[PDB]
């Protein structure tokens, strides 16, 4: 199904699992990537991917963007490289689909999505100064797999 | 902006409207230099290219007019020389100048002669396996030299195997 | 998915209406090359016969062999170039300036024209020459007529007037060439303009077929099979779709067929002669006997017998001229039988 059907925030907050049954599992494999034993303050450089428009991103788009971002970091910095990426948003919003005409139209559950407001951080990677241009490229691949336009903002780095 | 170009002693250049004529011992070249708010004039013995505007588009053309005039100065004195070499693998190619046009016969085994017309005062001299294109107007000479190489264009078959054709050897 | 098919008939000969002049009017003329000369002649259609010829074409495997070629016999007696019209280049195209006439007129030209009694050929000639000096002169054409009285099989004595161009050398030399033809008596023959073996363009007003339906007029199909027995035999399917809610002029409809001007291109002149060599036994059907100046045009020519056809050197020939073909035999067999 296209994202056009689920990208906007038009329906109410439908997250209550005690009233919703048959919710598909999250396609998101990991949320903490890289070296999850080391701290965030141990790295000189902190670059985040900032979502420009208020959207609803599906778990499949979240997985595709994360997989195409971390796979570049596994390629350029190694499998056990000196970095750590974090996906801070979790898919809480349960999605429906009316799949009979318009009679008894309340749809059955087909998936999950994450509500991200404009200006928020979807991804945040902590790396060293030499690996700064590799992460800006991991986010360039990651923003092409989500719905809004994005900003690659450096929050801790006066090394330019 | 304003760029002043000192005219050589061998050269003397007149101007009317937007046209600039440059005369010398190797010949004469008349060109039209027309662009918004750029005035090209002859101040005694210097050529002045000036404009009241300093934007990238205006600046691009001032620099283009400079190189056009400097090239005309070189053309009417020392001239422009383009050297070429006629190479063939199996079929003996016959390059000959027939009138105001250079004709290439028996190219790649063709029964029909390939020909191109020479641009203006440009002279094409042949000495066996070598061809030398020359004249005062670089525009005319550069094109006539190019026309000769383009004349043996092959789009149908592999260029790496079928390498026959006159190629530019010397660029001025 | 319903098979594709080219549309019925051509749209280039439109509208298919009756011709204004029965005398054909050329819309194009040949290029100025060699010696100054009149760019066309005229005659009257006689009929058809065949001729045995020796193959002139160098590229043919049959070069030198006997070949039977169909031919249209046209009676071409001498014509009279009675005047010289001059055109001037105006910003609105070419406009007629003046005409230079004569004194010598054919006895029966007063059947069509209000023949000149008082004219000044010198003041007209002066006007044309001042225009040439000014560089305002366009082209030079001659007002020409035919002598149908010379043709016994054609009932009309009333001359057919038409304008013909003079092209060739410089505008100065052809002005003079034109004036020399006129100032004599205007008399010129087919020989003066054409040579046997050249490609000519024949213009003519076609055979009149009155009003005919779409099948004959545009070559549309007849109704096929079961559709042919219902009450519709030679009527098209529909006059158009629902939308656009109008009938387009492109749909094949009924109306006038024939009696239209056609300009048949690249017609080879087999032989130009005089006498009774191409005449058929018992005479040409619905025409008569030929005994005078004629032309033999390869193949068909527009219009019926007795109709005025026009000649012009081919504006767009495909082949190079192969002059004076060897005529081994001309048929004289009766067209009846």
């Amino acid at each position: 199904k296209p994202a056009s059907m689920y990208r906007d925030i038009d329906k109410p907050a439908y997250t209550r699992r005690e009233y919703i049954t048959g919710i598909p599992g999250s396609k998101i494999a990991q949320h903490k990537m890289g070296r999850k034993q080391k701290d965030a303050d141990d790295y000189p450089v902190q670059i985040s991917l900032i979502v420009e428009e208020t959207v609803q991103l599906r778990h499949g788009s979240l997985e595709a963007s994360r997989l195409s971002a971390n796979r570049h970091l596994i390629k350029e910095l190694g499998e056990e490289g000196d970095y750590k990426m974090t996906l801070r948003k979790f898919p809480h919003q349960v999605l429906r689909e009316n799949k009979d005409g318009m009679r008894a139209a309340f749809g059955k559950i087909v998936g999950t999505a994450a509500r991200v407001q404009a200006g928020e951080q979807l991804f945040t990677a902590y790396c060293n100064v030499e690996d700064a241009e590799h992460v800006k490229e991991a986010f360039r691949r990651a923003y092409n797999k989500i719905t809004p336009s994005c900003r690659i903002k450096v929050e801790r780095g006066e090394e330019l | 902006p304003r760029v002043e170009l000192e005219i050589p002693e061998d050269v003397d250049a007149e101007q009317d409207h937007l046209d600039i004529t440059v005369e010398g011992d190797n010949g004469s070249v008349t060109r039209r230099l027309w662009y918004p708010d750029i005035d090209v004039s002859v101040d005694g013995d210097t050529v002045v290219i000036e404009s009241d505007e300093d934007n990238a588009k205006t600046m691009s053309t001032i620099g283009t007019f400079q190189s056009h005039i400097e090239n005309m100065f070189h053309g009417v004195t020392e001239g422009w020389e383009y050297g070429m070499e006629v190479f063939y693998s199996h079929f003996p190619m016959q390059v000959n100048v027939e009138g105001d046009e250079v004709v290439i016969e028996n190219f790649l085994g063709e029964k029909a002669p390939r020909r191109t017309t020479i641009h203006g005062d440009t002279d094409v001299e042949i000495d066996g396996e070598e061809l030398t294109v020359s004249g005062p107007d670089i525009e005319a000479v550069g094109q006539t030299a190019a026309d000769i190489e383009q004349l043996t264009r092959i789009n149908d078959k592999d260029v790496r195997v079928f390498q026959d054709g006159v190629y530019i050897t010397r660029k001025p | 998915p319903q098979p594709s098919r080219p549309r019925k008939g051509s749209l280039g000969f439109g509208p298919r209406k009756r011709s204004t002049s029965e005398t054909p009017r050329f819309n194009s003329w040949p290029s100025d090359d060699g010696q100054p000369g009149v760019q066309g002649f005229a005659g009257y259609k006689a009929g058809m016969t065949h001729v045995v010829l020796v193959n002139d074409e160098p590229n043919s495997p049959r070069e030198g062999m006997e070949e039977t070629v169909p031919v249209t016999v046209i009676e071409t007696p001498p014509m009279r170039a009675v005047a010289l019209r001059a055109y001037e280049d105006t910003p609105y195209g070419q406009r007629p300036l003046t005409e230079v006439w004569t004194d010598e007129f054919h006895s029966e030209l007063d059947r069509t024209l209000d023949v000149p009694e008082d004219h000044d050929p010198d003041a007209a000639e002066e006007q044309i020459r001042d225009a040439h000096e000014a560089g305002d002169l366009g082209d030079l054409r001659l007002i020409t007529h035919t002598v149908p009285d010379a043709v016994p099989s054609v009932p009309k004595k009333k001359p057919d007037v038409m304008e013909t161009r003079v092209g060739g050398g410089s505008v100065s030399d052809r002005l003079d060439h034109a004036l020399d033809i006129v100032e004599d008596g205007g008399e010129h023959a087919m020989n003066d303009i054409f040579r046997a073996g050249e490609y000519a363009d024949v213009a003519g007003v076609t055979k009149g077929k009155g009003t005919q339906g779409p099948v004959k007029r545009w070559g549309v199909q007849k109704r096929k099979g079961k559709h042919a027995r219902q009450g519709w035999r030679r009527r098209i399917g529909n006059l158009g779709p629902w939308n656009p809610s109008r009938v387009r002029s492109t749909v094949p409809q009924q109306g006038q067929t024939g009696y239209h001007q056609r300009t048949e291109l690249n017609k080879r002149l087999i032989d130009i002669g005089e006498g009774d060599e191409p005449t058929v036994d018992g005479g040409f059907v619905n025409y008569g006997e030929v005994d005078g100046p004629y032309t033999l045009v390869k193949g068909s020519v527009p219009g019926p017998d007795k109709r005025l056809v026009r000649f012009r050197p081919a504006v767009r020939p495909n082949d190079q001229p192969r002059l004076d073909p060897e005529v081994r035999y001309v048929s004289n067999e009766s067209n009846q039988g």
């Binding site: - | 918004p36 708010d37 005035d39 | 910003p91 609105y92 387009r248």
Partner: protein
């Protein structure tokens, strides 16, 4: 043939629409206007797109007809008509008292109207009406 013009306008190096707008205003005020040198009249912009617009107008049509002039003679005349209510009595009289010409059929040199002239030294992106007509397929007779 003679046309007693009150105002004779020189279209040479002048922006067509601006001249046309003024020639219309004058014709409705009862003036007998004559546009001269329309082959040399000008219209600013990218030649490639200007020609496309005019070529489309020539390709447009049906059985009812959409007669669009190819000559600069008629193009300027049609531009003036678009600024006049030619279907109304007052507007037709105004239009019929305006005539466009190729060159200058008069002795007098025409006047250049204010705000209509284009400085060729300041402009490169423009076209001459004659150039438009040559591209449209018209016979150059100027």
């Amino acid at each position: 043939a003679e046309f007693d013009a009150d105002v004779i306008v020189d279209a040479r190096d002048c922006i067509m629409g601006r001249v046309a707008s003024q020639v219309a205003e004058q014709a409705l005020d009862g003036e007998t206007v004559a546009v001269v040198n329309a082959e040399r009249a000008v219209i600013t912009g990218r030649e490639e797109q200007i020609v496309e617009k005019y070529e489309k107008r020539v390709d447009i049509g049906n059985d009812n007809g959409y007669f669009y002039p190819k000559r600069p003679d008629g193009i300027f005349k049609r531009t003036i008509r678009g600024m006049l209510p030619h279907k109304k009595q007052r507007g037709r009289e105004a239009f019929e008292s305006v005539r466009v010409y190729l060159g200058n059929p008069y002795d007098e040199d025409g006047e250049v109207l204010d705000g209509t002239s284009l400085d060729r030294l300041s402009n490169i992106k423009f076209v001459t009406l004659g150039e438009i007509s040559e591209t449209l397929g018209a016979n150059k007779t100027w």
